[PDB]
């Protein structure tokens, strides 16, 4: 049971390091315009219950990267994400008052993603 958690959650950072990735291979005029778009943060993320976080931006997200333009496309990537997201967190998600950017987005739930499967290993 522990081991199905930290592969849900292994392939949800597999994701989104996928889009992190192919945001970084904009180009710059393109990027800079991109990374004028709000996101929100959790004030907390440490447990599987936070993902509504995630959960609530996911729609932003497919947006933004809907607005640019490849091989795969936006909305099987976040649908993939989503079921993921649905069936790990299983409560209303307390927002961070400062917005980030996509990239700082994706960097915090990465990092939040690697730091609750190192406590399954
Ligand atoms: S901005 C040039 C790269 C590009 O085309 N992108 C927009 C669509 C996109 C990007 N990364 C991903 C991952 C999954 C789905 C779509 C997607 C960057």
């Given at each position: 049971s522990?081991?199905?958690?930290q592969?849900?959650?292994?392939?949800?950072?597999?994701?989104?390091?996928?889009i992190l990735?192919?945001?970084n291979?904009?180009?710059n005029?393109?990027?800079?315009?991109?990374?004028t778009?709000?996101?929100?943060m959790?004030?907390?993320?440490?447990?599987?219950?936070?993902?509504?976080?995630?959960?609530e931006?996911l729609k932003?997200?497919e947006?933004?990267?809907?607005?640019a333009?490849?091989?795969?496309?936006?909305?099987?990537?976040?649908?993939?994400?989503?079921?993921?997201?649905?069936?790990?967190?299983?409560?209303m998600?307390?927002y961070?008052?400062?917005?980030?950017?996509?990239?700082?987005?994706?960097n915090?739930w990465?990092?939040?993603?690697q730091?609750?499967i190192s406590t399954?290993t």
């Amino acid at each position: 049971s522990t081991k199905k958690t930290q592969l849900q959650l292994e392939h949800l950072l597999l994701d989104l390091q996928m889009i992190l990735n192919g945001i970084n291979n904009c180009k710059n005029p393109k990027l800079t315009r991109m990374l004028t778009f709000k996101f929100y943060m959790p004030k907390k993320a440490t447990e599987l219950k936070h993902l509504q976080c995630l959960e609530e931006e996911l729609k932003p997200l497919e947006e933004v990267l809907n607005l640019a333009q490849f091989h795969l496309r936006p909305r099987d990537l976040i649908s993939n994400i989503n079921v993921i997201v649905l069936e790990l967190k299983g409560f209303m998600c307390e927002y961070a008052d400062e917005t980030a950017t996509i990239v700082e987005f994706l960097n915090r739930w990465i990092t939040f993603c690697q730091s609750i499967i190192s406590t399954l290993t």
